[PDB]
Design an enzyme around this catalytic site. Structure first.
Site, PDB file in Angstrom:
ATOM      1  CG  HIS A   1      -1.993  -5.031  -2.538  1.00 17.22           C
ATOM      2  ND1 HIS A   1      -1.405  -6.235  -2.858  1.00 17.22           N
ATOM      3  CD2 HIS A   1      -1.845  -4.891  -1.197  1.00 17.22           C
ATOM      4  CE1 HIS A   1      -0.925  -6.801  -1.765  1.00 17.22           C
ATOM      5  NE2 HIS A   1      -1.170  -6.003  -0.743  1.00 17.22           N
TER       6      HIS A   1
ATOM      7  CD  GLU B   1       1.352  -3.094  -0.972  1.00 17.87           C
ATOM      8  OE1 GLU B   1       1.900  -4.215  -1.090  1.00 17.87           O
ATOM      9  OE2 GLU B   1       0.530  -2.669  -1.791  1.00 17.87           O
TER      10      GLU B   1
END
Length: 228
Positions: A81, A153
Site C-alpha cells: 500500500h 492506487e
C-alpha cells in the site's frame, strides 16, 4: 465476462461498523474483505461473522509471523500500500519478497501498485506502475497468480472513470503479454483511491475494474453494492 468482484476495506467506531456489516444482506456474488492491524485483529475476528467477508492482515514480512497468522485463521493479506513505499521505505523488491513469502505461506494476497503526482505529470505512469508489477512477477510462478489480486492506487480527488480504466487496461495488457491471456482474464484488478457510493458504481462500469480497496467507513456498504 468479468471474474468475481472484491470489495475490501483497509483499516489505517469499529464495533459499530462491524455491527452494520453483519446486518447487511448482500444479494450478488462478491468477496468482501476487512483488512486490519495486528492489535485490532482479534476483536475484528471475534465480532465479524458475516460469511461473505474474510479478515486480512497487513504488511507482515516475517515467516514465523506469517505462520502465526495462518494458525490463528487469517488467510488474506494486503501488501505494498502506498505509504509502505513513500514513507516506510519498502522498495519494489521488498514488496515483491513479502508477496512471494505470503503466497508460500498459503495466503491470498492483495498487492498494491500506483504512481505519484510527479510521476503522472511527467508522463511516467506506465513505466512506474509496470516496473512495480514486474518486480512482483519475478518472484512468482504462473500457478501463483490464482492467489494474487492487484490494487491500483493513484497516489495523487477521484480519478475520472476514463483515467482509472486507462491504468487498469495498461496493467491487464502487460499481464496478458508477459504472464498469459488465461491469467489476465481471471485476475482481479481493484481501484484503490478516492471511492464513495456514487462514483464507485460509475467506476465499476468500466471494462477492466473488478472492485475496490477503500476505507473502513460506514460508506463501505454502498461500495459493496456498487460491484454490479
Amino acid at each position: 465476462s468479468k471474474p468475481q468482484p472484491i470489495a475490501a476495506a483497509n483499516w489505517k467506531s469499529l464495533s459499530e461498523l462491524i455491527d452494520l456489516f453483519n446486518s447487511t444482506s448482500i444479494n450478488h456474488d462478491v468477496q468482501c474483505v476487512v483488512a486490519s492491524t495486528f492489535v485490532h485483529l482479534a476483536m475484528t475476528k471475534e465480532r465479524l461473522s458475516h460469511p461473505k467477508f474474510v479478515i486480512a492482515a497487513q504488511n507482515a514480512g516475517n515467516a514465523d509471523a506469517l505462520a502465526s497468522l495462518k494458525d490463528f485463521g487469517v488467510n488474506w493479506i494486503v501488501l505494498g500500500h502506498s505509504e509502505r513505499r513513500w514513507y516506510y521505505g519498502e522498495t519494489n523488491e521488498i514488496v515483491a519478497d513479502k508477496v512471494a513469502a505470503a503466497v508460500a505461506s498459503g495466503f491470498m494476497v492483495i498487492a498494491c501498485i500506483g504512481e505519484t503526482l510527479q510521476e503522472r505529470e511527467s508522463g511516467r505512469t506506465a513505466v512506474v506502475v509496470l516496473t512495480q508489477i514486474a518486480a512482483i512477477a519475478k518472484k512468482l510462478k504462473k500457478a501463483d497468480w490464482a492467489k494474487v489480486v492487484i490494487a491500483y492506487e493513484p497516489v495523487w480527488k477521484v480519478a475520472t472513470p476514463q483515467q482509472a480504466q486507462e491504468a487498469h487496461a495498461l496493467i491487464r495488457s502487460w499481464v496478458s503479454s508477459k504472464i498469459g491471456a488465461d491469467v489476465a482474464g481471471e485476475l482481479r484488478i481493484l481501484y484503490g483511491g478516492s471511492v464513495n457510493g456514487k462514483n464507485a458504481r460509475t467506476l465499476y462500469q468500466q471494462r477492466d475494474v473488478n472492485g475496490f480497496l477503500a476505507g473502513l467507513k460506514p460508506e463501505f456498504v454502498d461500495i459493496i453494492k456498487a460491484t454490479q
